[PDB]
Amino acid sequence: LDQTNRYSDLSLKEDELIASGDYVLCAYLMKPKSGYGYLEAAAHFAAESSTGTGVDALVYEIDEAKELMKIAYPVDLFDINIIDGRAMLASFLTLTIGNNQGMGDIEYAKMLDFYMPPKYLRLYDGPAVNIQDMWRILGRPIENGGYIAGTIIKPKLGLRPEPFAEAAYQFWLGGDFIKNDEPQGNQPFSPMKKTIPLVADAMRRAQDETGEAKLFSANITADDPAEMIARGEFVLETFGFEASQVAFLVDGYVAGPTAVATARRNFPNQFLHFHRAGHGAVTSPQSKRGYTAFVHIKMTRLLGASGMHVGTMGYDKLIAYMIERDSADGPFYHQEWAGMKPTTPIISGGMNALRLPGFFENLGHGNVINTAGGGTYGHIDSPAAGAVSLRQAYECWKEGADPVEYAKEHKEFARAFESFPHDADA
Amino acid sequence: QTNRYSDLSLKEDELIASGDYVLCAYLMKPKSGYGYLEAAAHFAAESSTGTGVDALVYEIDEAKELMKIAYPVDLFDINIIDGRAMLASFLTLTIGNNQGMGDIEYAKMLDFYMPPKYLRLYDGPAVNIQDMWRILGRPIENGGYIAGTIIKPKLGLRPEPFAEAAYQFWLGGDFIKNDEPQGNQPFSPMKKTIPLVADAMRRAQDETGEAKLFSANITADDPAEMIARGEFVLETFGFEASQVAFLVDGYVAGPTAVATARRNFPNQFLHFHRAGHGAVTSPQSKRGYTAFVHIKMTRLLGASGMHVGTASDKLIAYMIERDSADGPFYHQEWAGMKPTTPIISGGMNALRLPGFFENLGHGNVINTAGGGTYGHIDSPAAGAVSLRQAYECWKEGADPVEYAKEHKEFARAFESFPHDAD
Numbered sequence: 001l002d003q004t005n006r007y008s009d010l011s012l013k014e015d016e017l018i019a020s021g022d023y024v025l026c027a028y029l030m031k032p033k034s035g036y037g038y039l040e041a042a043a044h045f046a047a048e049s050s051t052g053t054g055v056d057a058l059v060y061e062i063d064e065a066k067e068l069m070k071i072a073y074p075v076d077l078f079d080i081n082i083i084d085g086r087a088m089l090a091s092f093l094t095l096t097i098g099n100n101q102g103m104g105d106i107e108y109a110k111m112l113d114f115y116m117p118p119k120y121l122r123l124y125d126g127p128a129v130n131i132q133d134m135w136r137i138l139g140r141p142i143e144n145g146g147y148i149a150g151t152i153i154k155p156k157l158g159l160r161p162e163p164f165a166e167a168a169y170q171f172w173l174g175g176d177f178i179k180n181d182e183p184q185g186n187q188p189f190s191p192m193k194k195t196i197p198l199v200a201d202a203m204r205r206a207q208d209e210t211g212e213a214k215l216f217s218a219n220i221t222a223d224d225p226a227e228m229i230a231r232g233e234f235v236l237e238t239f240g241f242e243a244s245q246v247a248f249l250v251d252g253y254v255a256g257p258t259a260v261a262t263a264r265r266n267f268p269n270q271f272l273h274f275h276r277a278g279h280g281a282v283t284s285p286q287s288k289r290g291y292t293a294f295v296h297i298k299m300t301r302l303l304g305a306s307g308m309h310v311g312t313m314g315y316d317k318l319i320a321y322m323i324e325r326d327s328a329d330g331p332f333y334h335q336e337w338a339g340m341k342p343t344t345p346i347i348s349g350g351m352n353a354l355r356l357p358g359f360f361e362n363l364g365h366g367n368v369i370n371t372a373g374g375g376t377y378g379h380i381d382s383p384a385a386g387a388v389s390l391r392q393a394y395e396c397w398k399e400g401a402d403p404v405e406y407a408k409e410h411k412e413f414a415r416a417f418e419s420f421p422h423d424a425d426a
Numbered sequence: 427q428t429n430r431y432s433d434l435s436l437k438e439d440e441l442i443a444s445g446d447y448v449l450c451a452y453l454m455k456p457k458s459g460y461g462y463l464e465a466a467a468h469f470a471a472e473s474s475t476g477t478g479v480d481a482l483v484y485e486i487d488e489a490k491e492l493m494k495i496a497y498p499v500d501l502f503d504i505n506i507i508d509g510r511a512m513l514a515s516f517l518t519l520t521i522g523n524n525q526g527m528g529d530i531e532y533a534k535m536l537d538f539y540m541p542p543k544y545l546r547l548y549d550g551p552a553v554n555i556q557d558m559w560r561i562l563g564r565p566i567e568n569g570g571y572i573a574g575t576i577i578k579p580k581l582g583l584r585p586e587p588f589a590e591a592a593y594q595f596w597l598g599g600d601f602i603k604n605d606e607p608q609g610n611q612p613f614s615p616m617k618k619t620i621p622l623v624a625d626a627m628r629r630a631q632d633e634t635g636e637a638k639l640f641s642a643n644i645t646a647d648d649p650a651e652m653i654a655r656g657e658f659v660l661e662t663f664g665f666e667a668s669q670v671a672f673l674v675d676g677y678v679a680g681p682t683a684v685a686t687a688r689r690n691f692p693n694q695f696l697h698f699h700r701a702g703h704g705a706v707t708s709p710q711s712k713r714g715y716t717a718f719v720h721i722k723m724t725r726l727l728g729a730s731g732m733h734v735g736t737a738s739d740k741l742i743a744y745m746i747e748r749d750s751a752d753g754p755f756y757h758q759e760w761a762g763m764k765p766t767t768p769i770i771s772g773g774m775n776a777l778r779l780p781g782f783f784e785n786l787g788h789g790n791v792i793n794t795a796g797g798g799t800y801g802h803i804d805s806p807a808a809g810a811v812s813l814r815q816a817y818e819c820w821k822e823g824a825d826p827v828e829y830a831k832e833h834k835e836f837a838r839a840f841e842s843f844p845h846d847a848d
Contacts, residue, residue, distance in 0.1 A: 097678075101705040251514055261647035280523075
């Protein structure tokens with residue numbers, strides 16, 4: 001087959017493809033359909049992912065036994081804005097994980113990593129805002145400002161405007177950060193133009209009573225970008241003098257990259273909180289299709305997410321490092337970011353003050369936003385005392401104090417012991 | 427939780443008759459140590475109120491790995507600007523966080539129902555194949571097959587060769603579309619290529635005396651870029667701007683990209699490209715949603731035409747082209763919501779197209795695949811004319827072989843594909 005010959009070259013060296021700065025590389029788990037040879041199916045994938053039948057994509061590496069295929073994409077395949085000469089993720093996705101996901105000769109193919117060379121990477125927006133901007137608002141250090149105590153209000157959807165605002169007020173007496181639940185917006189039982197003014201008033205009340213600054217992440221997701229812009233402007237107008245303290249929450253997996261670029265390019269001076277609801281449909285290890293969480297979370301930095309949800313890391317630090325450092329390793333590719341702004345990890349899926357010190361030891365820092373369910377609403381006293389116990393668990397860790405010794409001086413952290421007694425170490 | 431988020435005593439028919447519930451039907455298998463109704467209820471919670479508007483498991487078939495949930499309509503998000511529905515909300519509630527739950531091995535959406543009060547809040551299509559029939563001078567009802575292509579190779583042609591292949595195709599064919607990644611690549615910049623494509627279309631119109639149709643890729647991250655591309659393309663097509671379709675890569679760019687086209691360019695056929703959809707809609711996937719559910723959703727968003735491929739998935743065709751249709755689980759009335767046109771990738775030669783038509787009941791479709799066009803021994807033009815002839819012959823119900831004499835392009839298809847119907 002001349003298709004196999006034209007669209008593969010196993011003699012190309014990865015090192016030299018990287019050195020040329022002329023190629024986007026992607027690594028995939030691929031398995032052919034029974035009867036198709038690995039190299040023929042791979043070359044066919046490279047063809048379907050580029051020219052069809054020199055801007056041809058090339059299979060440069062196969063491991064038939066490991067079900068591993070590696071493809072070099074000449075940079076000039078990728079689409080460029082007519083308005084500003086910048087890159088679009090939509091083009092990266094359509095070539096490298098587009099048509100190639102419907103091919104009859106392939107049982108499955110999943111992107112595990114990619115490499116973007118400097119001349120292409122620098123054409124992406126990258127983030128304009130991150131946790132540094134939140135540290136600045138809170139009056140914490142601009143380097144290693146540490147842990148931001150956040151929550152979702154429970155119940156997650158269904159609270160009328162007034163009970164929502166009252167629960168937010170109660171939380172902000174102790175915690176830093178509240179996010180809308182990702183579906184939360186302008187539902188008939190809690191309209192946006194009723195709820196948002198009461199949340200802004202709740203935030204001011206908690207600020208007046210504590211003398212501390214607070215943070216809110218408002219859902220602006222919609223289909224119509226005019227509606228995302230209307231939501232964004234209404235929220236900033238409503239928060240008024242506190243408008244700088246509002247993050248914009250975007251469901252960028254189900255709404256897609258265009259919704260995310262809408263927030264990034266219309267509201268660059270606001271923290272862009274990327275919510276990934278629905279991502280598991282492809283990123284689950286149970287799926288052999290689409291792309292991994294690692295690939296997803298790396299692309300969100302390119303889009304300019306200020307913070308990205310990354311989960312619990314086993315309670316996965318490699319994903320955090322790839323978004324928060326200038327120089328990082330994927331499972332297959334080393335990536336230099338050339339000072340593209342970090343995206344902040346936002347951790348979720350429970351976690352309580354007793355297990356926080358081990359989470360920080362593994363990560364090597366606590367420069368993260370935590371939207372903790374169990375950790376705050378499981379505290380015996382109050383969700384506010386729960387958020388204080390979480391910050392105190394960070395402060396204890398940063399000091400290197402002994403948690404139990406630390407508890408003697410810190411009632412909220414002490415009462416965490418009595419809150420989670422079967423977590424609490426003998 | 428299980429008690430709160432499930433009620434198996436609820437009757438599907440009364441949920442539909444209330445007009446107060448969106449219903450979703452899913453293939454669901456719990457993790458090994460988890461009971462089926464416990465997992466389903468937990469899924470309903472994660473898909474609604476977590477903890478009036480609690481979503482409810484109303485039906486499980488543990489043996490069939492099947493779970494049906496009722497979603498009170500008031501859960502769904504509404505635009506502040508125009509009081510209209512947004513698909514982003516239906517996706518985040520019905521196939522959102524529920525796709526990352528540790529106590530579920532897999533859950534895939536197989537069908538959904540929208541009651542009339544909520545359905546009518548969606549844009550629906552504003553344009554479909556009827557608008558193309560009008561342009562082509564063909565009947566407004568059952569105007570038949572539109573003969574289409576993608577220029578080969580897929581990507582890589584310079585502007586002048588791309589425009590030349592478009593001119594050559596249009597001498598026999600009706601419709602050309604960008605390949606889905608084709609836009610403003612450096613080797614074929616949009617502002618060089620589109621003017622030459624428009625020129626090629628005018629030359630083909632002048633020599634044939636027939637109208638032609640082009641589908642221009644306007645996909646981008648930035649909605650401002652989608653609008654600049656769409657404006658540049660209408661400006662350049664000038665007097666032929668009515669004959670331009672806007673192609674959006676709606677799966678990889680998402681519903682916000684499609685609404686951008688739908689709401690800024692409602693007067694232009696919105697051609698929905700689904701590159702990457704296979705990552706979830708493949709029968710090999712147990713996650714996300716089926717091609718049926720995907721294609722159903724595109725009609726809501728207002729796709730004028732939707733790629734559906736090429737027997738029983740004409741269950742799909744009926745759901746996008748009719749006012750009244752049945753999914754695998756739910757009957758849906760569209761109450762006059764404009765139909766979405768199937769765009770097929772049907773390779774089939776002029777001699778095999780008939781069996782496709784036979785199975786469909788009609789040839790009211792746009793065809794973009796190349797097998798019957800580029801496989802023709804003479805020219806891609808001749809191949810397009812052969813496929814039209816194969817619709818026209820099948821429509822008139824003439825004898826293929828008797829029709830072949832008097833129709834040289836269909837004739838030469840017999841010599842082009844000596845195997846088949848023999």
